[PDB]
């Protein structure tokens, strides 16, 4: 059940095309890392000296990148995605080194313990694995096997996951309402902390693994004694579900954001003096404090919008609190707009899209291009204005989960759409005008660089897709199976992968020419 997907995007896409899920920081190189709902992990530069913060993009995963962890002093980065994978990256040189495929559902969170270079992946498959970062980064193609280690316990899907610095407590948070705790060495269950009435998206542990801060969708933050296996305190600073938390170096002050949109610094010892730092534009998904100064100077914040703000906490000591501290950001990283709507047109070739700015635009699916921006124009009126009396059957599917256009071609309807070359827009001095197959005409423009589809030819003649367009061979509701760019097809290792991954049904009309 092997599909073929491809993406209609610019070669770089230097901005987040969708709302950011997770933030690391590397204080040696003053770089941010964003992890995007738009599949892409970008590296930034937090020098306000620089005008152009962008540095690189780190591109492999197919769905959302739900969480990231930076480790080995910024050398290595670990990513977890709705595409069910856990990926190991070289964060200096910005490229993916390994894919771990041991989860069975979205990998939803990642936890890190510096002092042993240990990470844990967890998610909707209710499972939690433990990974020694050092063995991951020595994965070759010859000593490529890793030995897997999990934790029994969770009875429902996991949404959050924290380890202490020492690598001696790990806490899962979950839709089970209840926090579960383990010792990562032995894997022994240590306790369950009953208390929250809802899912738990946020978890923090002090360095010693003796206290825990938990943020939940019940709208409360909780401070836990792991010694007295019970809840010490319960702070209700928000109206709505708390989905992110940071803490200061002494575990006295908790920064908290979520759906509410308001972000507060709260003093655990004195709740009634909370400073409302800001009301963000969107729901807060994650935060990361600037840890180069005690009184933490700054907090970076991610939301469902593609724009990533910093906020300074300059006046915290002298600043229900109705009045902000900051009313505008310190820095900004800018965000690209997201395609929120799609109409296939009657010809099953032109797509018409609306984005997060209400910028309508006209796209050729077959050739895999934009054609024209049409600005803040009405969309359903423009549907009409581009009506064409004709009927073509369905041959592809669209989805917008990345916020970029992602076209998918299943075996079943891919070819059920013949259109005659003249009204399709392809001339000839002959006036040949045969009934061409749009789906099949697409498959060979995608694998146009691949030698196995190359005597006295290269392509299907009538059109080329852009050479940067990424092609994705996936599985029905399944694992992403191989990924490349259109132009890269001719590479040595890549033709070997295309042999063992391209299904018979695409061999049929790209190699053999049967349909």
């Amino acid at each position: 059940k092997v599909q073929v997907s491809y993406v209609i995007r610019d070669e770089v896409e230097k901005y987040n095309r969708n709302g950011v899920n997770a933030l690391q920081l590397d204080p040696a190189l003053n770089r941010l890392f964003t992890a995007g709902r738009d599949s892409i992990i970008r590296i930034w530069s937090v020098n306000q000296h620089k005008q152009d913060p962008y540095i690189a993009s780190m591109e492999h995963h197919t769905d959302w990148v739900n969480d990231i962890v930076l480790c080995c002093n910024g050398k290595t980065l670990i990513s977890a995605s709705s595409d069910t994978t856990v990926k190991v990256w070289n964060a200096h040189k910005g490229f993916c080194m390994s894919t771990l495929r041991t989860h069975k559902d979205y990998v939803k969170a990642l936890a890190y313990a510096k002092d042993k270079e240990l990470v844990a992946s967890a998610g909707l498959d209710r499972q939690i694995f433990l990974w020694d970062v050092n063995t991951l980064t020595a994965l070759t193609a010859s000593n490529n096997t890793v030995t897997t280690s999990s934790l029994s316990g969770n009875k429902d899907s996991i949404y959050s996951l924290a380890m202490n610095q020492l690598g001696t407590i790990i806490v899962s948070g979950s839709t089970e309402k209840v926090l579960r705790v383990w010792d990562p060495r032995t894997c022994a269950k240590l306790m369950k902390l009953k208390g929250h009435t809802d899912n738990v998206k946020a978890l923090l542990l002090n360095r010693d693994g003796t206290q825990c801060l938990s943020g939940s969708s019940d709208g409360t933050i909780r401070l836990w004694s792991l010694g007295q296996q019970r809840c010490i305190a319960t702070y209700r600073v928000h109206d709505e579900g708390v989905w992110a938390l940071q803490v200061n170096d002494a575990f006295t002050h908790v920064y908290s954001g979520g759906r509410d949109r308001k972000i507060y610094c709260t003093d655990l010892r004195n709740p009634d003096i909370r400073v409302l730092i800001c009301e963000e534009k969107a729901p807060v998904l994650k935060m990361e404090l600037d840890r180069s100064a005690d009184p933490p100077p700054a907090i970076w914040v991610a939301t469902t919008k593609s724009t990533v703000n910093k906020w300074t906490l300059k006046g915290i000591h002298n600043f229900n609190p109705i009045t902000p501290l900051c009313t505008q950001p310190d820095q900004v990283i800018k965000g690209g707009a997201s395609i929120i709507q799609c109409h296939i047109l009657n010809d099953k070739r032109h797509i018409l899209t609306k984005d997060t700015n209400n910028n309508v635009a006209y796209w050729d699916v077959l050739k895999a291009c934009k054609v024209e921006d049409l600005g803040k124009v009405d969309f359903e009126d423009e549907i009409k204005k581009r009506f064409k009396m004709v009927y073509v059957p369905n041959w592809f599917s669209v989805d917008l989960k990345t916020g970029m256009l992602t076209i998918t071609l299943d075996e079943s309807d891919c070819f059920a759409a013949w259109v005659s070359a003249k009204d399709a827009g392809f001339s000839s001095p002959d006036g040949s005008d045969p009934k061409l197959n749009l789906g099949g005409l697409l498959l060979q423009a995608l694998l146009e660089y691949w030698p196995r589809t190359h005597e006295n030819q290269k392509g299907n003649g009538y059109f080329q897709v852009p050479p940067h367009t990424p092609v994705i061979f996936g599985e029905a509701g399944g694992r992403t199976l191989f990924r490349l760019l259109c132009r890269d097809s001719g590479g040595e290792t890549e033709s070997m992968l295309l042999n063992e991954t391209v299904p018979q049904w695409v061999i049929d009309i790209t190699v053999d020419k049967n349909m």
Partner: protein
């Protein structure tokens, strides 16, 4: 010095429900103030005037509802559900001579929401449903108040069957849940004791012990729910003896002022509230007599 009805064949379904309905203080008022209402008013007038044979009712009912015509037994909930909104679309018709809430809807009517939630968005979408009966499924050694929480359990859309979130613009986990939003003036609780356990290609009776209090609040409530702590008082219950759907005998239990009253077929008997604990259900479950509750009528305090 008492009242009663008469058992022609298997009229106990009519008998029990009718008595139960007559002891609902706001129904009894509006049932006689002013078709099948014409015989219900003819019999509710005939009891306030004074063992009455409710003839006019039985063959009158056995004509214009052919499902009842049989002489075989009859599920007392089917009758209750029918009787009640047979009346309401007559009170709708007499309004259409001269989509508006009738006087049956002022009493037995309530609403409940079907909530759906992105566990990611945390955004939440409602689809309401009006009801007259609340039909609640039933387990061994339990309370209606537990069984009511089961009604409002959380179904979880996940894995290969995840939910497309409009806002999340993708496939996410979600929780679907039913909750009472508008509570009725009279909460009628049906206990689903008759369950088509299709091993045999048949129905079976569940003689499980389900306890019910005389005073009642609901925990199920919507959150946007309008009057969520309506205290209730047990007005009347329909017990039911026997061991199957079609060999049963229905009985009523009733409150008017202090006294509590049984109505077997004809035969009335004053019994103290202490005596309602016989009608909870069986533990050891000999599948035997299981004299046991079935339709519970709770009335608002306010």
């Amino acid at each position: 010095h008492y009242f009663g009805l008469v058992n022609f064949g298997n009229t106990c379904y009519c008998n029990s429900v009718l008595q139960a309905l007559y002891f609902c203080r706001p129904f009894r008022e509006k049932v006689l103030a002013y078709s099948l209402l014409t015989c219900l008013a003819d019999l509710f007038h005939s009891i306030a005037t004074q063992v009455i044979p409710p003839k006019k009712f039985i063959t009158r009912l056995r004509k214009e509802n052919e499902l009842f015509d049989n002489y075989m037994q009859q599920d007392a909930h089917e009758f209750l559900n029918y009787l009640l909104n047979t009346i309401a679309d007559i009170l709708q018709e007499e309004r259409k001579q001269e989509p508006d809430p009738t006087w049956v809807h002022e009493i037995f009517q309530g609403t409940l929401t079907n909530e759906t939630r992105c566990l990611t968005c945390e955004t939440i979408s409602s689809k309401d449903e009006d009801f007259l009966d609340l039909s609640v499924d039933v387990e061994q050694n339990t309370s209606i108040t537990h069984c009511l929480r089961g009604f409002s359990n959380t179904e979880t859309l996940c894995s290969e069957y995840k939910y497309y979130c409009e806002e999340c613009r993708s496939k996410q986990e979600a929780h679907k849940r039913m909750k009472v939003k508008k509570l009725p003036m009279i909460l009628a609780l049906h206990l689903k004791r008759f369950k088509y356990m299709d091993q045999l290609h048949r129905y079976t009776k569940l003689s499980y012990r389900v306890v019910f209090p005389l005073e009642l609040r609901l925990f199920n409530t919507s959150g946007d729910a309008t009057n969520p702590d309506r205290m209730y008082d047990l007005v009347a219950v329909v017990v039911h003896c026997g061991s199957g759907p079609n060999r049963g005998h229905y009985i009523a239990i009733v409150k008017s002022h202090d006294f509590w009253l049984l109505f077997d077929d004809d035969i009335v008997e004053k019994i103290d509230a202490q005596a309602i604990e016989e009608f909870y259900g069986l533990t050891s479950d000999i599948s035997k007599n299981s004299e046991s509750g079935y339709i519970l009528f709770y009335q608002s305090r306010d």
